[PDB]
Amino acid sequence: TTICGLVCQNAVILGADTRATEGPIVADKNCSKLHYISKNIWCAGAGVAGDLEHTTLWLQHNVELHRLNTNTQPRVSMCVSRLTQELFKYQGYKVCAIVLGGVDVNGPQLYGIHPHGSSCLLPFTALGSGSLNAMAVLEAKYRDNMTIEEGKNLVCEAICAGIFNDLGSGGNVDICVITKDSYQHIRPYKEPNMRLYHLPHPTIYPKGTTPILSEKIEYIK
Amino acid sequence: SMYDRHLTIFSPDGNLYQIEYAIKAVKNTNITSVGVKGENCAVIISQKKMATQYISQDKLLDYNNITNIYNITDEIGCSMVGMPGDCLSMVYKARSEASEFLYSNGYNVNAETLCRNICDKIQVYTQHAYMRLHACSGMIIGIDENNKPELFKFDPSGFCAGYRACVIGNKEQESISVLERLLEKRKKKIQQETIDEDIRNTTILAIEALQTILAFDLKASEIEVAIVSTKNRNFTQISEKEIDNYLTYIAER
Amino acid sequence: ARRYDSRTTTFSPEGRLYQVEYALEAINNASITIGLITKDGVILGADKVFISKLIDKANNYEKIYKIDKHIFCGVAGLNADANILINQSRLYAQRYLYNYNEVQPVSQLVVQICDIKQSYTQYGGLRPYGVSFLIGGYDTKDGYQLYHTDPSGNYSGWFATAIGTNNLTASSVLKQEWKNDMTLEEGLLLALKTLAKSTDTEIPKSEKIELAYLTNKDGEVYQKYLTEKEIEELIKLYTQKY
Amino acid sequence: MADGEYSFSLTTFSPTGKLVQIEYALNRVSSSSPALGIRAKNGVIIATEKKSPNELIEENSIFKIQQISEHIGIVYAGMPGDFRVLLKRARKEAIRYSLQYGSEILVKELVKIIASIVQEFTQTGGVRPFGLSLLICGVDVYGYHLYQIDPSGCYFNWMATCVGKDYQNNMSFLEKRYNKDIEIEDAIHTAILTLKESYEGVLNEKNIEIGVAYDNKPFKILTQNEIKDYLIE
Amino acid sequence: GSIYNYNGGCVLGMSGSNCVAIACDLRLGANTFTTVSTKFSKIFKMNNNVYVGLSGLATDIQTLYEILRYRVNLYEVRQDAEMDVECFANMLSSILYSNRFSPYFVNPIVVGFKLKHYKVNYEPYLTAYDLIGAKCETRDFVVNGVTSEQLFGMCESLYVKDQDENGLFETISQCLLSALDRDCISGWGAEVLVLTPEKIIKKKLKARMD
Amino acid sequence: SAGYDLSVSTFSPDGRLYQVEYIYKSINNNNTALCLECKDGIICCCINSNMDKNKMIKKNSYNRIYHVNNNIIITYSGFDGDARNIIDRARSEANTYYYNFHTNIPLHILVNRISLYIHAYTLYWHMRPFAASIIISSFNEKDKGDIYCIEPNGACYKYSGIVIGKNKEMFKTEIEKKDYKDINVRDAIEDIYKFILTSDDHMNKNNLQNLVNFSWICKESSYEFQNIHEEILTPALNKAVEYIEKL
Amino acid sequence: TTIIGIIYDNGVMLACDSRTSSGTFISNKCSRKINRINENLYVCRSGASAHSQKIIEIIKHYCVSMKNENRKKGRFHEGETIDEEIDIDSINYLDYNNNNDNNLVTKNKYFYEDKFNDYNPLVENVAHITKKIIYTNNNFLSCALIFGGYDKIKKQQLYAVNLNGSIIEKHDFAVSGSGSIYIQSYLQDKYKKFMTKKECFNLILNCVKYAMHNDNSSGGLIRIVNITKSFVEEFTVVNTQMNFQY
Ligand SMILES: O=C(NC1CCCC1)[C@@H]1CCCCOc2cccc(c2)C[C@H](N2CCCC2=O)C(=O)N[C@@H](CCN2CCOCC2)C(=O)N1
């Protein structure tokens, strides 16, 4: 996995590859790693797939409940507190390394959350198996006060570094831009990987080639 | 049944008379508090008076300790009127609710939500027969996350709401008339105020309102005034000297 | 606080349980619910209580409920208590299926729900459930079945019966007209007759009738909740036959 | 207290079979500010009377129309604290369903769960029933729904209904001019007209709250200006 | 790891045009090499539009199937409708995760139709799971079981988009059979279910029995 | 009354809680306790005049003055058992405060906690409310005296001098004549004995020795709890007695 | 990690490096190991990041509760009426970085709201409740903390909460983290009683610089917090390199 995020002008930008592996096998080639928490808060997930899916769903629904009961814009700090407390409660056995980003009254914020429950407010970060490659690119090229287009290009370059240099990453590049007034989830954003060779004609088995022992037809309604 | 006015159960007409009697118990304390909202601030003024209760006021009583204004947090305070045991109990409930909110969510609760959570607590007393009602009505002020003042008021029935200005006390229809007159008089001016001018006008309006309600000359030593503003978001009382200066200005006008 | 206790689960000087008698009075004050067994399935019929012409009369059955695929009930009494117990009985049927990998026999389900009701009459200090159930179903052990439950946790099997208001008239009509080998159509027409005669009229009204039946056909048990159109067809057939 | 010998039913059967506490809660509802809902062709509207006691109170601080989830709204007639508790519970159950099944809670499922919660308080020991009625409107895959929940825990499916003060006369007014093939605008006008006929005096954009769910869109509470436009005619 | 080798088995899902197919081997292993049954189906019908394939430990297969049947039956009786396939998929994920730390040793797939009610449109729906409920939504095919690598190779090489029911049957059957022929602990028969909005066709393949 | 006075959890139609008022009556019928702030300390006195006919009680064995951390005086008027309960709770709160923070619990926080404890027994329909009012007080050089009195309803107020129990009004009338913030505790002893001789008509110069508990926290005792020695109470008792018998 | 506290004549100074690492990899270049508990009470974090972070969050909550319970009823102080600034810019000047990034806030200063220290929790109380929390779960928790603050009773104070949940008060200086072992004797030799603000600042900065030079687990930038009776000053130093004549 390669997930990354950075802060730019009045916006937070997240990026992710889309590979899920089961051992050395690619289990999902187009899995989504960018998760909607609220209109102004998203997060990218690396680690155990099931933990990420269920932790981000729980966080999203609790955040919506909080928003309804208070009628105020959700805070990124609240997501940090809730998530870190949960993860700490599980002493790192919930393997969730999360880049959390959003925009609220305190402006654009980005946090790197670790499975044991620590958090860190940062201008940029990357997590996952490809985080070292993406961090190389981000450290080389990050700047304060980038425009959204520049930030998108840099996030894409970082994710591509992870995709092409880490075996655990691959697939397409997904991006989300989170501003004060809305978000923009682009999926796919890059699509750098496709099948190169195709056979000149797809194998179509003639009808009746497979031998069968029994057959029953059962109609519906 | 014969006990429909003893427990929190409906009477034939649909009333819960225990709630009415708890409200009357609040009214019996003879304590008056007034909260007023400005453009960038909010004020609460209360009498530094012992609630009319079984015991009376001794001349060895330390009158500085008598108060009905409390801090819930650094930035949220309130006035609690009613039975002093119940008022202290509600103060502690509100403080613990605010602290729990802060720990759970990593940011301070604003006044509206704290009032609503308190009232959700009170509703449980209104529905469960084995608990007495808390004879306590409160006013809560603070500055919300958009730098706007908040003024909210709860009462024993668990009903809360926001206000431009409010009064807890024996009389409240006539207090409402006085407050409405003061607010429209303040609003009819078109000149823009400074932060300090706004705070001064709000405090003067609160003092003059409490005075026109109680119908006697307030002495600075016998009232308390607490403010929250965008200049100083902390809920802080003001000195007896500043209250006295506001009173001298009010009288000479 | 004992002065406020109404002592629901306490014997009366005649070995009676007053809360149960009052719950039975409430059930007797509810609209008529009838049931009868043919050779083609169990029929449940009910009179709908009018509230307003603005009620949504589409796919809205409020007196006959599916418990499982092979079980369904009619309700007489407090509808919210009935909703509680119906949820419980659906849970019970599914629990039996989970534990035994086969569908629950009807009598066992009736026994479980009646145990809930009896327990409320014996333990605790709460009021009993104010509902009577007409539970019908099919299973291989006992074929088509029909049961009647009351607030005391009692029950009993029936070939035809009625609960709710004016059950005496409907029961007499069933006693005179119910036969041991009836077809589904004959059963439906007899159900319409007893519903019409218990509601003090001669031609029944589709707007006020809930009719459903439960058949074991070709090995599948299948429940049919007649719409207003199908009931209108049956009303025309009834007015032909009478 | 809440356990031991002191947990006995406060709602019990009378000789005639009635549960008088439920009747008294019903009276309490019938004395409350009117509310109503209308199921139109491509949406459902819930409207309420919100009469400000004084010029001091902040209207926005009091909303009798609340959102439970996207596409589901709720209004009540009766005691407001009870309403707050039940609204919090409804939101909780909506998110519990959403966590189990991913998608949004179906209106019928929510209504059944909330009705069961209401019913519990007419049987469990040491409590009174809730003193309110709820109207729950929503849109899901299976169409538009308008449900009422009574203090006893019974629920009804409505094409249009009114709860609270003099709701029989309001019901006659609403049934005189409701068809199942109305539009959103016609429904809003009808709701406003019904409330006018009930309210004594002159209504305005501050005396009424309105919530809509139409054309497969998220539930929306009409602002002051939108209601003002609806009131221009 | 070896727990999954105790019984063996695999499941495979595939979609065509207005059709979807689910297939499984029929073996019940014991001790990784002893075949004790040849009619142990891994395919279960939740409702007419929702099937689940459960590979892994047979005890956990049966237990999870019973839990899922309980949940689906309760949901559908309460709602008075058939459970949507996506709601069922999310529910299965939640059930598997609820046992996150002592999980059911199962490798499920879900195959069925997502109904888009206007008339009704039937969109094939496929999902593969891990034992703690992570989900992989797909349009072409899903695989699970100890034969996963062979099924992945066969599907990547042979799957053809938008096949009719007969083409779908031939393709999924060939994929399953070729994959099974390379596995020591799977096979001994194959059942293939081809789903259309109108009918279900259940076939047993004349497969290898060694 | 009218049936509204059988439970502490039922408000009367006029808004009053009658069980609390009945407890107040019980307390006002019980023995007298007072605490007085002086220039260099606070002085507490309990007059056990209800025990005047109990001739066989061991001399000076019944004492109503306790302490919390060796620097806070806590006394009461009302039921002994309830007061012991509340004092146990006060000490438990002091222990917990030290455990959590390693400093002694401040007087005002302890007062709030005790008052909340007491108030919690007025809320339910199955618990008897405490029939006792509590005096809690301390004194140190920098802060001078702090005296709080907690009511059975749970209301705590701060005083310069307090009298609870029987004949409290006459005692307050006598106490209020002089500003004791400028008098020393030793000098206040004789005043208190004179007040006892006058106000409590059940007390004479014969049982003044065995019926009165005296304690203080003052400069002489290093601002820590101490029962006043009989070698200090004796001359003061004799002087008050002779002065009174003169008039 | 290197965290230091030094008591000087008019206050207490807290300094730290900012590097957080997982092995040899630096996961966070510039963490924030000096955290405000109350307006006049800070803690320096050492040990496992998750442990110290969650402990400090709990302690902040406890401190809010204590502070609001410390508030007395009434009004007070109706009459009561209540140093050479560090040239931080010159400390942070480097030839090769001059206006390369003009916008850079390297300093902040604020005044106490509780001017008389009427309700601010005592430093000792907060430190001891923290020690209690760590000790109760010292089978799992591994983090060492330094508390620094000012209260009206004991003035400027340092409390070291060591691993396993013991507490020691320091009256001169406190050091923790893998980097402080290297500067142990340097600080011991250079420390004197009643140092000025300038001397204390230079000393604490040089201590952190030497520790970062010698310890791979330390690095990044340097954060210095100065706590006085009336205000708190915070500085960031980015000129951390060490130049040896030899
Ligand atoms: O890519 C991955 N994360 C990214 C992809 C999206 C979010 C981020 C990880 C990368 C490796 C992590 C493996 O550490 C585990 C620790 C504990 C439990 C499990 C895994 C569970 C399970 N295990 C463990 C071995 C047997 C088995 O089955 C397993 O490997 N899960 C796979 C995904 C499974 N499939 C679900 C449906 O189809 C898509 C993939 C998985 O979590 N991979």
Q: Which of A21, A131, A166, A169 to mutate to test the pocket of ligand 1 (most atoms within 8 A of CB)?
A: A21
Q: Do F158 and B129 touch (CB under 8 A)?
A: no
Q: Determine how many CB atoms are found less than 10 A away from the CB of residue F188.
A: 24
The DSSP code sequence of chain A is --EEEEEETTEEEEEE---EEETTEEEESS---EEEEETTEEEEEEE-HHHHHHHHHHHHHHHHHHHHHH-SPPPHHHHHHHHHHHHHHTTT-S-EEEEEEEEETTEEEEEEE-TTS-EEE-SEEEESTTHHHHHHHHHHH--TT--HHHHHHHHHHHHHHHHHH-TT--S--EEEEEESS-EEEESSS----------SS---PPTT-S-EEEEEEEE--
As a whole number of angstroms, the distance between CA A158 and CA G229 comes to: 48
Residues 6-35, chain D: which have Cβ within 8 Å of C?
6-19
Count of beta carbons in the 10 Å neighbourhood of residue E209: 11
Shortest Cα–Cα distance, E66 to chain C (Å): 6
Separation of alpha carbons G159 and G147, rounded Å: 5
Q: Which of B34, B62, B61 is nearest to B47 (CA)?
A: B34
**DSSP run (H or E) holding D175:** helix D167-175
**CA dist., res. C182 & res. C41, Å (int):** 10
B60 reaches F (C-beta below 8 A)? yes
For F155, the token pair is: 């209301």
Query: What's the farthest any 2 CA atoms get from each other in chain F?
Result: 57
Sign of CA dihedral A9, A53, E102, E37: negative
Cis peptide bond prior to A188, omega within 30° of 0: yes
Q: Does the annotation mark A1 as catalytic?
A: yes
Residues in A touching D68 (Cβ below 8 Å): 68
Number of domains in chain C: 1
The answer to whether position D5 is within a domain reads: no
**Which CATH number do you get for residue G116?**
3.60.20.10
A219 φ, ψ (degrees, to nearest 5): -80, 165
Q: Which residues of E touch D99 (CB under 8 A)?
A: 94
Dist. CA F54–CA C170, nearest whole Å: 84
Query: Which candidate, G144, G159, G57, G149, places its Cα nearest to that of F102?
Result: G159
> What is the distance of C-alpha C164 from the center of its chain?
10
Q: Which residues of D touch F126 (CB under 8 A)?
A: 1, 6
Q: What is the distance of C-alpha C145 from the center of its chain?
A: 12
The DSSP H or E segment spanning C72 is strand C71-77
β-sheet with G166-170: strand ranges across: G34-38, G41-45, G145-151, G155-162, G166-170
CATH code of the domain in which A153 resides: 3.60.20.10
Cα dist. B253→B247, B248, E174 in Å? 11, 9, 100
Q: How many domains is chain G partitioned into structurally?
A: 1
Sign of CA dihedral G144, G148, G152, G154: positive
CA atoms within 13 A on the CB side of A193: 17
CA G215 from chain centre, in angstroms, equals: 19
Q: How far apart are CA B172 and CA B165, in angstroms?
A: 12
CATH topology classification for B1-251 = Glutamine Phosphoribosylpyrophosphate, subunit 1, domain 1 (3.60.20)
**Domain extent at residue A76:** 2-186
**CA gyration radius, chain F:** 19
Record the tokens describing residue E80, joined without a space: 């008075």
| Secondary structure (3-state) at G135 | helix
Which residues sit opposite E109 in a β-bridge? E53, E128
- Angle at G146 (CA atoms; ends G144, G147), nearest 5 degrees: 135
Note down the domain range covering D32.
Answer: 10-233
Beta pairing class for D155-157 and G166-170: unpaired
DSSP state for residue B143 in the 8-state scheme: E
Angle between helix B84-105 and A76-89 (nearest 10) = 80
> Which residue type does D74 have?
I
Cα distances from A87 to residues A4, A61, A113, E102, in angstroms, run 20, 17, 9, 18
Declared resolution, Å: 2.2
Q: Are E128 and E144 in contact (CB under 8 A)?
A: yes
D176 exposed, middle or buried (CB, 10 Å; 0-12, 13-18, 19+)? exposed
How far is CA B137 from each of CA B34, F175, F217, rounded to the nearest angstrom?
A: 12, 36, 39
Euclidean distance between CA atoms E202 and E194, whole angstroms:
7
For B228, the token pair is 């929250």
B68 contact A CB<8A: no
Give the separation between CA C26 and CA C76, rounded to whole angstroms.
Answer: 9
Q: Is the dihedral of CA A89, A95, A99, A104 positive or negative?
A: negative
CB C131 within 8 A of CB C84: no
HSE of C55, CA atoms in CB hemisphere, 13 A: 15
User: Cα–Cα distance between E173 and G79 in angstroms, integer?
Assistant: 94
Task: Please list, in sequence order, all residues whose beta carbon lies within 8 angstroms of the beta carbon of residue A212, skipping any fewer than 6 positions away.
Answer: E203, E204, E205, E206
Q: Are E200 and E191 in contact (CB under 8 A)?
A: no
Evaluated on CA atoms E149, E150, E151, E157, the torsion sign reads: positive
Sheet holding C220-225, edge to edge: C160-163, C33-37, C42-47, C209-217, C220-225
Q: What is the 3-state secondary structure (H, E, C) of C134-155?
A: EEEEEECCCEEEEEEECCCCCE
Q: Calculate the alpha carbon distances from C31 to C48, C170, C210, G226 in Å.
A: 7, 12, 11, 82
* CA C65 – CA D58 distance, rounded (Å): 47
Euclidean distance between CA atoms A213 and B89, whole angstroms? 79
The residues pairing with D37 across neighbouring beta strands, listed in sequence order, are: D46, D161
> CA A2, CA A9: separation in Å to the nearest integer?
23
Quick one: closest CA in G to B98, which residue? G65
Please state, in angstroms and rounded to a whole number, the distance separating the CA atoms of residues G57 and G72.
26
Contacts of B195 (CB under 8 A, 6+ apart): B40, B41, B229, B230, B231
Residue nearest to atom 20 of ligand 1 (CA): A48
| Cα distance between residue C213 and residue A202, in whole Å | 54
On whether residue G246 sits in a domain, the answer given is no
Tell me which residue of E77, E29, B234 sits closest to D112, measured CA to CA.
E77
The binding-site residues of ligand 1, defined as CB within 6 angstroms of any ligand atom, are A 1, 20-22, 27-28, 31, 33, 45-49, 52; E 128-132, 134-136
Kindly tell me whether chain G and chain C come into contact, counting contact as 3+ Cβ pairs under 8 Å. no
- Would you give the DSSP letter of residue F50? G
Angle at E195 between CA E193 and CA E197, to 5 degrees: 160
Which residue intervals of chain B are DSSP H helices?
17-28, 84-105, 111-127, 173-187, 195-214, 240-251
Does the CA dihedral D157-D162-D163-D169 come out positive or negative?
Answer: negative
Cβ contact D159:D174 at 8 Å: no
Residues G205, G17 contacting (CB under 8 angstroms): no
* Residue F193 near residue F240, CB atoms below 8 Å: yes
Torsion of CA F161, F166, F170, F172, to 10 degrees: 10
Identity of the residue in D26, D80, D128 whose CB atom sits nearest the CB atom of B9: D128
Structure letter (DSSP) for residue D52: -
Q: At what angle do helices F107-119 and F80-101 cross, to 10 degrees?
A: 130
Tokens 């890059």 correspond to what residue? A190
Residue A108 resides in a domain: yes
Q: For residue D132, which of D75, D62, D94, D92 has the smallest C-alpha distance?
A: D75
Spatial separation of the C-alpha atoms in residues C56 and D142, rounded to whole Å: 14
User: How many other CB atoms are there within 10 angstroms of residue C203's CB atom?
Assistant: 11
CB G129 within 8 A of CB G62: yes
Coil, strand or helix at F168:
helix
Residue C98's domain spans which residues?
A: 2-240
d(CA A22, ligand 1 centre) in Å: 6
Q: At what angle do helices B173-187 and B195-214 cross, to 10 degrees?
A: 150
Q: Are D6 and C53 within 8 A, CB to CB?
A: no
Q: Which residue has the tokens 């609270």?
A: D164
How far apart are alpha carbons A13 and A125 in whole angstroms? 11
Closest by alpha carbon to F147, among F36, F40, F58?
A: F36
Neighbours of B172 (CB within 10 A): 16
Residues 6+ apart with CB under 8 A from A146: A6, A8, A9, A154
List the CATH number of the domain containing C48: 3.60.20.10
Report how many domains make up chain D: 1
For residue C155, which phi and psi values (nearest 5 degrees)?
A: -160, 170
Beta strands F65-67; F41-47: pairing state? unpaired
- The coordinates were experimentally obtained by cryo-EM
Going by their DSSP bridges, the two strands E43-47 and G25-28 should be labelled as unpaired
Give chain B's largest Cα–Cα span: 62
Element housing D157 (H / E) = strand D155-157
Rounded to an integer, what distance in angstroms lies between the CA atom of residue D188 and that of residue D177? 12
- Say which CATH class F2-240 falls into: alpha beta
Identify which of G61, G17, G57, G63 has the alpha carbon closest to the alpha carbon of residue G40: G63
3-state secondary structure B58-85: CCCECCCCCCCEEECCCCCEEEEEECHH
In CATH, which superfamily holds the domain spanning E9-206?
Aminohydrolase, N-terminal nucleophile (Ntn) domain (3.60.20.10)
> Is the C-alpha dihedral spanning B1, B2, B8, B11 positive or negative?
positive
Specify the residue for token string 């195959």: E111
Assigned domain for G92 exists: yes
* F185 contacts: CB under 8 Å, gap ≥ 6: F38, F39, F40, F41, F42, F43, F216, F218, F220
G103 domain residue, yes or no: yes
The Cα F147–Cα F157 span in angstroms is 8
B73 within 8 A of G64, measured Cβ to Cβ? yes
How are beta strands F32-37 and F41-47 bridged, if at all? antiparallel
Residue of chain F whose alpha carbon sits nearest to that of C1: F125
Please say whether the beta carbons of A84 and A50 come within 8 A. Answer: no
Q: After which residues is chain C broken (C to N over 2.5 A)?
A: none
F100: helix, strand or coil: helix
In terms of Cα–Cα distance, which of C185, C231, C239 is closest to C208? C231
Which one of A118, A142, A143 makes the best mutation probe of the G interface by having the most chain G beta carbons within 10 Å? Answer: A118
CA-based nearest distance D6→chain C, Å? 7
Q: Is beta strand E10-15 parallel, antiparallel or unpaired with respect to D72-78? A: unpaired
- Point out the residue among D25, D58, D129 whose CB comes nearest to the CB of B162: D58
Closest atom, ligand 1, to C-alpha of E134: 36
CB burial of B40-66 (b: ≥16 within 10 Å; e: otherwise) equals bbbbbbbbbbbbebbbeebebbbbbbb
Contacts of E29 (CB under 8 A, 6+ apart): E6, E7, E8, E9, E35, E36, E185
Question: Strand, coil or helix: what is E96?
Answer: helix
> How many domains, in total, are found in chain A?
1
Strand, helix or coil at G84? Answer: coil
Q: What is the dihedral of CA D163, D166, D172, D175, to 10 degrees?
A: -20
Query: Cβ(D65)–Cβ(D210) under 8 Å?
Result: yes
* G69 interaction partners in chain B (CB closer than 8 Å): 95
In a domain, G47, yes or no: yes
Return the sign of the alpha-carbon dihedral for residues B108, B109, B111, B112.
positive
Is residue B137 a contact partner of residue B11, using CB atoms and an 8 Å limit? no
Q: Are strands C64-66 and C71-77 parallel, antiparallel or unpaired?
A: antiparallel
CA distances from G74 to A31, B69, B85, B220, C115 (A): 62, 9, 18, 13, 63
Q: Hey, is the C-beta of D3 within 8 angstroms of any chain B C-beta?
A: no
Q: Say whether B41 sits in a helix, a strand or coil.
A: strand
CA B21 to chain centre: 20
